[PDB]
């Protein structure tokens, strides 16, 4: 990745938001975030790691859409 | 007529009692000129999906305001995908199969940044407009 | 002074009262929504209410390519290439649906219509959706872009080379040949420059519109 | 409320949460075996483990140090900083 | 043409003959061959000849920007005329070896 | 207006639409009382040696005032069911598609840009 810290930070931060969920099924939200971080990772090139991290970062922000 | 209004909290709880498999309720900002709230719910069988969709629309009419326009269910002929549009809420009834292939939640949470948009690249015509084998 | 094109009426047998009626209606609407001074070359961002949604706000940015119509129904058309698709929207000026009109970049081009930009190369019509307004001092001459644009292959929407279009903003040298140029010249009509009854002077007309406008404010 | 933070009791509650985890089973689980290598757990897996510790004791774990915590023994020593146990 | 032409590809000998002509004579080759400028690109010379013969045709492609008319010549047609161009004396006397 | 024997552009991520081929897709048929098809109308396509139903999404012919006007004839491939074969629509679609009578909700769902 860009930073090994940053990805583990992102995985942490996303799961923290999951606790604050109100309407969305919390079991599914957790399952959906887990599998994403599994199958995508362990196999990528340096350049595309900059893109995939950013994809997660905009998920964190939730500016364009926030799941509740 | 007066009492409970049509909103997410009532609508979701209404879904849940028919064994809604997964629920994703998504806040959509005003710049995306479609809806206030996007909802995705899964189902067990084709006839189970009809059950839910038809209950939701039926209950809608009960609590519906007089001037509040009537709504139409979509895709009754369809096997796996059913959709119902309300005023400020949009709901998608699917099998787990179609959820795996559409990824509607991903599209709407992150717009231009999804994986499915990345694979596809825009095609440009060559300069001087000459093709070569 | 600048008078909006819509206010000056076309030659007709329409009674003057009809124009007076329409002018009063237009002027009322102008008070409510500020109509900026824009030209055909200029860049505009228009914010409107979206009826297909529950009063959500839509903005669209693009380059003006034509400005036409008279009275309330007067219009303009904005062009732009959004993520690899050319889009054109015709807007009414006095439609209540429109929220705000801003002039992002006020400039004239060489010619009064830019419909040839469809046949021009894509980049000449590609304008950034999020660009910062660039403003000039109030008592400055309206700046002109003297850009001539490169073209696609010769099958075009219209035959621009013909002198009836009188396009000054196309790099003809690049695309056409000398023989094609002299072929186009067969449609010249040189008398038409000197046809005296063909001309339409709006001097006294515009003066009277000014008198009405200054009375309104 | 003040709970007695016995070092032995700290150990018990730490191993209690690890047996609660799906990936790791009590058969191969020990007090001295580390998560990443011995218990064969991924780096993302670790993040969840530390969250279990986060809410249990109710003291914040910064992201800077969460990285170096890769052993149960390291944890029982780390949470000993919260309330000093000698024994 | 002494040996069977199936051994060499249809477009294969073009680059080799371009190298041979660049070795000995290029200016006369440019004048006879209708190049805008001297170059070692086989694609450019194949485009230059097709336009000279006029065998090319406008073929539509539809894009978001609009309908554009690309010209898609007979690449096979350009491939053969190279042999008569070499065999005839217009290019100039050039030993391949 | 898209009628019989009109070339169209498939603006989808669907394999069938984006596949390289010697023919542009052609409009076999228009599902309207009169042959002309505007936006939102369904039309039949001949692509790659098969017939496929498609939804018209924007066209070159001028429409009502504030409605957008595109520079290519854009269609989305759909099943007879109504399910779009593709997953994503890169190209912007007009918002008007919403209020028009019929099954448009699914196509709106998979679109990114509204103009
Ligand atoms: P952990 O020790 O199991 O590994 C950490 C990691 C999987 C997040 C990652 O750093 C890695 O080892 N692979 C990099 C490939 C990748 O997809 N990077 C993350 C971008 S979101
Ligand atoms: Mg035409």
* 3-state SS, one letter per residue, for chain B: CCCCCCCHHHHHHHHHCCCCCCEEEEECCCCCCCCCEEEEEECCCHHHHHHHHHHHHHHHHHHCCCCCCCCCEECCCCCCEEEEECCCEEEEEECHHHHHHHCHHHHHHCCCCCHHHHHCCCCCCCHHHECCC
B75, B111, B117 member nearest F82 (Cβ): B75
Q: Which two tokens stand for residue C183?
A: 């072929």
Angle at C86 between CA C120 and CA C60, to 5 degrees: 120
Q: How many CB pairs under 8 A join B and E?
A: 22
Q: Which two tokens stand for residue B121?
A: 């690249």
Which residues are F89's β-sheet partners? F111
- Contact criterion met (CB < 8 Å) for E71 and B126: no
Using a 10 angstrom Cβ sphere, with 0-12 exposed, 13-18 middle and 19 or more buried, the burial of residue A57 is middle
Dist CA C161 CA C178 (whole Å)? 12
Find out whether A9 and D63 touch, Cβ atoms under 8 Å.
yes
- Of residues F112, B108, F101, B33, the one with CA closest to residue C49: B33
Angle between helices B46-63 and B8-16 (to 10 degrees): 140
Q: Which two tokens stand for residue D35?
A: 């998560």
How many residues are listed for chain C in this entry? Answer: 217
Angle between helices D43-57 and A4-18 (to 10 degrees): 50
Query: Burial letters for D6-30: b for 16+ Cβ neighbours within 10 Å, e otherwise?
Result: eeeebeeebbeebeebeebeeeebe
Angle between helices A26-39 and A4-18 (to 10 degrees): 170
Q: Which residues of chain F does C84 touch, with a Cβ-Cβ cutoff of 8 Å? A: 90-91
- The three-class DSSP label of residue F18 is helix
Is E63 touching F (CB cutoff 8 A)? yes
- Of residues B23, E86, B75, the one with CA closest to residue F80: B75
Number of H helices and number of E strands within chain C?
Answer: 4, 5
Chain B residues within 8 angstroms (CB to CB) of chain E: 123, 125-126, 129-133
Dist CA C123 CA E91 (whole Å)? 42
F62, F69, F115 member nearest C60 (Cβ): F115
> Element (H or E) spanning A54, and its range?
helix A48-61
In this structure, the dihedral spanned by the alpha carbons of residues E37, E42, E45 and E49, taken in order and rounded to 10 degrees, is 180
Q: E strands within chain A?
A: 66-67
Dist CA C26 CA C72 (whole Å)? 6
- Of residues D76, E65, F109, F22, the one with CA closest to residue C122: E65
Find out whether C75 and F65 touch, Cβ atoms under 8 Å.
yes
C-beta atoms surrounding F73 within 10 Å? 24
Q: Which residue of F has its CA nearest to B73?
A: F103
Find out whether F107 and F71 touch, Cβ atoms under 8 Å.
no
Tokens 């109030």, residue?
A: C138
Question: CA B121 from chain center: how many Å?
Answer: 26
- Contact criterion met (CB < 8 Å) for A29 and B24: yes
Dist CA C73 CA A67 (whole Å)? 44
Find out whether B45 and B51 touch, Cβ atoms under 8 Å.
no
Q: Give Cβ neighbours of residue C71 (< 8 Å, ≥ 6 apart).
A: C6, C9, C19, C22, C26
Dist CA B34 CA B28 (whole Å)? 8
Q: What are the φ and ψ backbone dihedral angles of C19, each rounded to 5 degrees?
A: -70, -35
Dist CA D50 CA D69 (whole Å)? 8
Q: Which two tokens stand for residue C212?
A: 């009405």
Using a 10 angstrom Cβ sphere, with 0-12 exposed, 13-18 middle and 19 or more buried, the burial of residue C12 is exposed
Angle at C67 between CA C64 and CA C71, to 5 degrees: 140
Dist CA D71 CA E13 (whole Å)? 68
Tokens 């998504």, residue?
A: B26
- SS (HEC) of chain D: CCCCCCHHHHHHHHHHHHCCCCCCCCCCCCCCCCCCCCCCCCHHHHHHHHHHHHHHHCCCCCHHHHCCCCCHHHHHHHCCCCCCCCC
Return left, alpha or beta for B66; rule: phi > 0 is left, psi -120 to 50 is alpha, else beta.
alpha
Dist CA A65 CA B37 (whole Å)? 10
Dihedral sign computed on CA atoms, order F50, F54, F60, F63? positive
Task: Tell me how close the Cα of A56 comes to any Cα of chain B, in angstroms.
Answer: 9
> Which atom of ligand 1 approaches the CA of D42 most closely?
3
Dist CA B100 CA B108 (whole Å)? 15
Angle at C89 between CA C86 and CA C93, to 5 degrees: 155
- Contact criterion met (CB < 8 Å) for F72 and E60: no
- Of residues F41, F47, F44, the one with CA closest to residue F17: F47
- The three-class DSSP label of residue C164 is coil
C-beta atoms surrounding B68 within 10 Å? 13
Number of H helices and number of E strands within chain A?
Answer: 3, 1
Q: Which two tokens stand for residue F13?
A: 């991520």
Q: How many CB pairs under 8 A join C and F?
A: 57
Angle between helices E75-87 and E42-53 (to 10 degrees): 90
Q: Give Cβ neighbours of residue E35 (< 8 Å, ≥ 6 apart).
A: E44, E45, E48
- Of residues E5, E10, E20, E13, the one with CA closest to residue E80: E10
Find out whether F72 and E66 touch, Cβ atoms under 8 Å.
yes
Dist CA F106 CA F91 (whole Å)? 16
Could you give the C-alpha distances from C127 to B94, C45, E22, F65, in angstroms and in order?
40, 11, 46, 22
Find out whether D10 and D83 touch, Cβ atoms under 8 Å.
no
Chain A: touching chains (3 or more CB pairs < 8 Å): B, D
- Of residues C97, F93, C52, C153, the one with CA closest to residue B87: C52
Is B2 touching F (CB cutoff 8 A)? no
Dihedral sign computed on CA atoms, order C142, C146, C151, C154? positive
Residues of D identified as active-site: 42
Q: Which two tokens stand for residue F24?
A: 């542009």
CB of A1 closer than 6 A to ligand 1?
yes
Q: E strands within chain F?
A: 9-10, 26-30, 42-47, 50-56, 69-70, 74-78
C-beta atoms surrounding F77 within 10 Å? 21
Dist CA C27 CA C20 (whole Å)? 11
Q: State the Rg of chain B over Cα.
A: 19
Q: Give Cβ neighbours of residue F96 (< 8 Å, ≥ 6 apart).
A: C52, F39, F40, F67
- Full domain range(s) for residue A11: 1-68
CB of D6 closer than 6 A to ligand 1?
no
Q: Give Cβ neighbours of residue C210 (< 8 Å, ≥ 6 apart).
A: C1, C3
CB of A14 closer than 6 A to ligand 1?
no
Q: Give Cβ neighbours of residue F83 (< 8 Å, ≥ 6 apart).
A: B75, B78, B80, B81, F106
Total count of domains within chain C: 1
Longest Cα–Cα distance of chain E, Å, equals 52
How many residues are listed for chain E in this entry? Answer: 97
- The three-class DSSP label of residue C184 is helix
Dist CA E36 CA E14 (whole Å)? 18
In this structure, the dihedral spanned by the alpha carbons of residues C12, C15, C20 and C23, taken in order and rounded to 10 degrees, is -30
Angle between helices E12-24 and E75-87 (to 10 degrees): 40
Dist CA E61 CA F24 (whole Å)? 8
Dist CA A45 CA C83 (whole Å)? 27
Mutate to test the pocket of ligand 1, among A4, A36, A42, A45 (most ligand atoms within 8 A of CB): A42
């Amino acid at each position: 990745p860009w930073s090994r810290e940053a990805v583990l930070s992102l995985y942490r931060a996303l799961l923290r938001q999951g606790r604050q969920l109100r309407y969305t099924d919390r079991d599914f939200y957790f399952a959906s975030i887990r599998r994403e971080f599994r199958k995508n990772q362990k196999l990528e090139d340096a350049e595309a790691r900059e893109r995939q991290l950013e994809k997660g970062l905009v998920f964190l922000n939730g500016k364009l859409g926030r799941i509740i | 007529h007066t009492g409970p209004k049509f909103d997410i909290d009532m609508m979701v709880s209404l879904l849940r009692q028919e064994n809604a498999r997964d629920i994703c309720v998504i806040q959509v900002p005003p710049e995306m000129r479609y809806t206030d709230y996007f909802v995705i719910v899964s189902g067990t069988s084709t006839r189970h999906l009809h059950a839910m969709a038809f209950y939701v629309v039926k209950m809608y009419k009960h609590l519906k305001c007089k001037r509040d326009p009537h709504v139409k269910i979509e895709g009754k002929d369809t096997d796996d995908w059913l959709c119902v549009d309300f005023g400020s809420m949009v709901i998608h009834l699917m099998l787990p199969e179609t959820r795996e292939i559409y990824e509607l939640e991903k599209l709407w949470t992150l717009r231009s940044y999804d994986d499915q948009l990345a694979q596809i690249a825009p095609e440009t015509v060559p300069e001087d407009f000459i093709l070569g084998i | 002074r600048f008078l909006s094109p819509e206010f000056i009426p076309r030659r007709g047998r329409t009674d003057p009262l009809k124009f007076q009626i329409e002018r009063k209606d237009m002027l009322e609407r102008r008070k409510v929504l500020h109509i900026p001074e824009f030209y055909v070359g200029s860049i505009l961002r228009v914010t409107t209410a979206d009826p297909y949604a529950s009063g959500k706000i839509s903005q669209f940015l693009g380059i003006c390519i034509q400005r036409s119509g008279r009275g309330l129904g007067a219009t303009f058309i904005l062009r732009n290439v959004i993520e690899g698709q050319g889009v054109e929207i015709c807007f009414e000026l006095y439609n209540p649906r429109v929220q705000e009109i801003q002039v992002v970049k006020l400039e004239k081009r060489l010619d009064d219509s830019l419909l040839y930009l469809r046949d021009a190369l894509p980049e000449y019509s590609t304008f950034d959706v999020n660009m910062k307004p660039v403003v000039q001092e109030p008592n400055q001459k309206v700046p002109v872009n003297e850009l001539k644009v490169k073209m696609k292959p010769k099958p075009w929407s219209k035959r621009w080379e013909r002198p009836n279009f009188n396009i000054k903003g196309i790099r003809f040298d690049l695309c056409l040949t000398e023989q094609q140029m002299k072929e186009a010249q067969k449609w010249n009509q040189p008398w038409l420059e000197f046809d005296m009854m063909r001309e339409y002077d709006t001097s006294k007309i515009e003066a009277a519109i000014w008198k009405e406008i200054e009375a309104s404010k | 409320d003040m709970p007695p933070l016995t070092l032995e009791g700290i150990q018990d509650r730490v191993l209690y949460v690890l047996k609660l985890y799906d990936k790791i089973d009590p058969e191969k689980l020990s007090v001295n075996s580390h998560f990443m290598k011995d218990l064969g757990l991924d780096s993302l897996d670790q993040v969840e483990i530390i969250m279990a510790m986060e809410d249990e004791f109710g003291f914040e774990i910064p992201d800077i140090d969460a990285e170096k915590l890769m052993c149960p023994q390291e944890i029982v020593d780390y949470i000993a900083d919260k309330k000093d146990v000698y024994e | 043409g002494t040996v069977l032409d199936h051994l060499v590809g249809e477009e294969t000998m073009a680059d080799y003959l371009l190298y041979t002509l660049n070795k000995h004579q290029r200016f006369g080759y440019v004048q006879h061959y209708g190049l805008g400028s001297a170059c070692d690109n086989v694609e450019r010379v194949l485009k230059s000849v097709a336009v000279k013969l006029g065998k090319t045709q406008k073929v539509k492609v539809l894009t978001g920007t609009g309908n554009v008319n690309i010209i898609q010549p007979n690449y096979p047609a350009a491939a053969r005329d190279f042999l008569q161009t070499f065999r005839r004396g217009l290019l100039g006397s050039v030993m391949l070896d | 207006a898209i009628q019989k024997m009109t070339r169209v552009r498939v603006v989808d991520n669907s394999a069938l639409g984006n596949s390289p081929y010697h023919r542009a897709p052609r409009c076999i048929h228009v599902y309207k009382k009169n042959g002309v098809g505007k936006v939102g109308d369904q039309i039949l396509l001949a692509i790659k040696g098969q017939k496929k139903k498609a939804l018209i999404v924007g066209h070159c012919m001028p429409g009502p005032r504030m409605t957008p006007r595109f520079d290519s004839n854009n269609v989305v491939l759909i099943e007879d069911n109504g399910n779009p074969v593709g997953t994503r629509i890169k190209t912007p679609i007009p918002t008007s598609l919403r209020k028009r009578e019929g099954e448009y909700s699914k196509v709106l769902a998979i679109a990114q840009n509204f103009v």
